[PDB]
Design a protein around this nucleic acid. Sequence first.
RNA 1: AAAAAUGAUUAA
RNA 2: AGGGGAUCGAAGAUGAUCAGAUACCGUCGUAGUCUUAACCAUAAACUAUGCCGACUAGGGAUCGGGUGGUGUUUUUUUAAUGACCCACUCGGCACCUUACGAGAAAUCAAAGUCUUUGGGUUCUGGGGGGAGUAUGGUCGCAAGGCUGAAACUUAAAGGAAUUG
Lengths: 206, 97, 217, 81, 129, 87, 48, 121
Amino acid sequence: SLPATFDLTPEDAQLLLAANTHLGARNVQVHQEPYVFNARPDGVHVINVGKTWEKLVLAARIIAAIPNPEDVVAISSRTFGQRAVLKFAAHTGATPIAGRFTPGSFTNYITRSFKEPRLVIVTDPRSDAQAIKEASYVNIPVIALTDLDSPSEFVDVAIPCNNRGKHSIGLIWYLLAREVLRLRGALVDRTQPWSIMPDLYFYRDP
Amino acid sequence: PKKRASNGRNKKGRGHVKPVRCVNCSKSIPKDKAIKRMAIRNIVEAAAVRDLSEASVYPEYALPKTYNKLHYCVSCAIHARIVRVRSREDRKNRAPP
Amino acid sequence: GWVPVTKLGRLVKAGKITTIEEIFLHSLPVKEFQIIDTLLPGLQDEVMNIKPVQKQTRAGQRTRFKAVVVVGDSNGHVGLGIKTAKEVAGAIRAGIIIAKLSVIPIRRGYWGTNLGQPHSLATKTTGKCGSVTVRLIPAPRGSGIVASPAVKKLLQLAGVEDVYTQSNGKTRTLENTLKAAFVAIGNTYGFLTPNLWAEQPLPVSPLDIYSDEASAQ
Amino acid sequence: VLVQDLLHPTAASEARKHKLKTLVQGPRSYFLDVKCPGCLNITTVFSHAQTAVTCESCSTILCTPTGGKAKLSEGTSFRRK
Amino acid sequence: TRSSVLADALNAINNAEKTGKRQVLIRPSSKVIIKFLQVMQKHGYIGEFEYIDDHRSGKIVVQLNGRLNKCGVISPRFNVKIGDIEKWTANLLPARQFGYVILTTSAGIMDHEEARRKHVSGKILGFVY
Amino acid sequence: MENDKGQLVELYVPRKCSATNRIIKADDHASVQINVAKVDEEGRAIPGEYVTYALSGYVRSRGESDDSLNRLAQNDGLLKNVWSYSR
Amino acid sequence: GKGKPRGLNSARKLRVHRRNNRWAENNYKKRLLGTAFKSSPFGGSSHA
Amino acid sequence: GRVRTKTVKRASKALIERYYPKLTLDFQTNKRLCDEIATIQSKRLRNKIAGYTTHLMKRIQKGPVRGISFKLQEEERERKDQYVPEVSALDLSRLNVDNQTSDLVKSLGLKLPLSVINVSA
RNA sequence: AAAAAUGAUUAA
RNA sequence: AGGGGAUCGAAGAUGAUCAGAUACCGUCGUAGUCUUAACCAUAAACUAUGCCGACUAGGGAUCGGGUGGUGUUUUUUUAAUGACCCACUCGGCACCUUACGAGAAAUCAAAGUCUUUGGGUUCUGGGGGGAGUAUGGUCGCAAGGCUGAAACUUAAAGGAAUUG
Ligand SMILES: [Mg+2]
Ligand SMILES: [Mg+2]
Ligand SMILES: [Mg+2]
Ligand SMILES: [Mg+2]
Ligand SMILES: [Mg+2]
Ligand SMILES: [Mg+2]
């Protein structure tokens, strides 16, 4: 069976609501359609936070299955995800890729930046399309932080959130790292919250 | 081979439009195909705006404008550098800028 | 010697992966030819044609030679490599490397009764490259290879000993003909048959089982 | 997509779809019991009448035809079914 | 206009199978279609299918199990002797060990193996493999 | 793959997609094998014990890989109320 | 589809269409017109 | 023209990477230091390298430069990258939700402090 | 928006 | 054939340019351009994509009709209406992304569902020329249209794309 402790806890529910992770895109693709809750006047849709949290738990279960922690590569070319992925890579092994992706990172075995990950997590499929495509060339499963209008091609595990907000992006990365640590012999306090407060995952200029 | 999906014009659904004449050469070109530009120009040049403002009975005069729709054939538009032949991939771009 | 760069090469060199069937089962991309050399040592080679291609420049025409190389043991593996280079020998050598990388498993079946080892294809298959369509059809025992000499040589290097072939398009384009036949012979494991209907337990990858000693720093 | 329950679809989805394009096609019009202030008679009218039906007592006009549903008169009450 | 509801049925099933769908809607779903589906269901190429009873012609929802490579009609329905069944199977089937050519014989709609067991022949309807 | 006297004769038996049951070819470089670690009490990943799904390059390129995974996880108990059979 | 009739009772149309389009071959046209007999320096002979 | 080629640019950048504290704003001592922190086959190239090194230094002094990370820069960057605010930018600080958001909370079955806001088209 | 024609055969 | 006949303008005139210019350019200008009553029946008459039917992909628009509103709007400062907004839906002219598919490619939501070849049906083609010629027929007042060869000749002609 599955323990009920993994349910949508009130605290991280308040966190997601404060981060506005439920305010999805105005336009929804049919592949993201099952994740929508309901549309508000002016057109803004609402993401089912229950689906978001459940998919985040599933993604964390994906991550905590590779025997090595350094071959779980995170990608974010967007400024709002640079700090988030760097902190995720600090807390877990998870060698990161912030900024330009340098096409040929997964192919081109003689490159110095060449990596052979077993799992790829990307902040935005649009901005990070090169990483997803090259993973499609080299048999790499992909978790992605997806909005309601983000493309679903080659995206294996989607997490329906708001990609237009730095608070939502940083919080989702924070929760993913926290859940991954919980599903390990390092963060046993499943009911207790993580020590450090999640503002270190948020980008601030410059 | 076929150069453009919209052959050289904008006509999909009727078959005949009407011909307009080029302003330069008076070449008969279908209206959907003619390169059309809006010439909205102040009736006085910038070198003269200050002078007419100084030499007007009517203080803060309206400073009227002139409006003209110009129809060019393809040849005259290219020769006058109105359109400036583009590359193959940039040929599809419809944006005015 | 050979110092592996990828995890697959590290596993194969260390000896954790012993047969190319594991490679094919997990559909692992292969990037080093030494993997193919050490997993299929009895992989023999053949050059199909050498043709010159020319590029026009200010100072005349510069000529390079494009070599077509077919590798394969007669026990169900072939690879096709096309490489252009300044010299014929260099093009042939790089073509051998490329074909070894592009080695593929084929499915031998029976035409009628299954008396003995498989002798033909399990199903008629068709491949296309450019205008050339190649169709391979299962044939009864004692039929031989009914094909043009190039496709016949590729099929012998594949291990097929009984098959009919039907071609269409400009078959004199040898590289298109060989690529089309390579696609057709590779689609044999792509075609699903009732004897493959049974569900399998979906085994885990050697890149995950023998993973603690891979990608060592 | 790629896996759907075509036999048991959503009532909101069928309410969205075209009248001819549901799992089993059927009408979306209806019949109205109509009461005018003139008398106590009840007149059964069709939602998309396409005629100017008239009451037995108020024998001038009850509804006006339109493109779709009939435009019932302002001095009139109605009840579905 | 429609001339073979069986052809539209098998084309729709084939397109859903190619696109990876696990279920397909068929209309108008005659009883020849139903017999064709029962033959392929007997051999395992499809799963459960459902007749929707609208009061005009019916519908079928077929559950697809991904085991079907191609199904289609042979139009027109040529008459076939006993000895031309082998020629038709050679022409239409990928292999001699699996796949079926569907016949409409006086004994009923059956597959070519069943026809050869019954020593019967008829018109050719379609194929499945 | 079976000859007269038993003795299965074949190079290898290919895997089938967990979503569409199509064969994953040896050169299908867009395919994946998603691996979900089983979880015991109080949330431990217990490495080495897994539930495995094979997804084809075709379905991934089509964009239904995520919905296929939602359905498979729902059917296998990994997820609770994510995938709805009736859309 | 295919721009040619398919019905079981269209054999006359198919045969006539093949007969008509057969006239676009060279050898069939020569055989049917008897050009070698009529317009050829030899009377269809190998030598003369 | 006086564009400095990649050999001068890369050698100067490497010098900045390796000996930023030792190097000084002026060409004379930068040139003298180059005699032993590097081996250059020609005095002309050494002078060019030192001139570009001191130019890069005079630019680094008034703000950082892209692509160059001297020893005193990455510790500063990482220390800046640990700024933890005392109060969370998002926390219990007054939350504001819509009718649909309240409906979502009720559907998921949770109890939170919500405030009603009606979005107007 | 001045005028501006021509260039033997073979010879990769 | 009658009327009309401003404009522009096959022919023509005439001035330039030019080696020549009975061309381009300039100025005139008959027939035509317009109309009525009759003829003619041809166009790169083009989407160079026959027609009918089914299915397969992700969007934003727009035209016509219809449906619905914890919608607005000039009237009653809270009425049908009309006009906008949002969500749909049927039909249409079309666009954007990508092809999973097709194609020699250019490209194509059809040019897909094609050697895994069969939904129905009409028309046309069979290397380049000779040649849409000759002849016969038929229509036209004529111009010409429709139908339409052969002798003979010849190794390419041709499509798309690449480099220069
Ligand atoms: Mg051209
Ligand atoms: Mg026209
Ligand atoms: Mg046209
Ligand atoms: Mg035409
Ligand atoms: Mg329209
Ligand atoms: Mg000809």
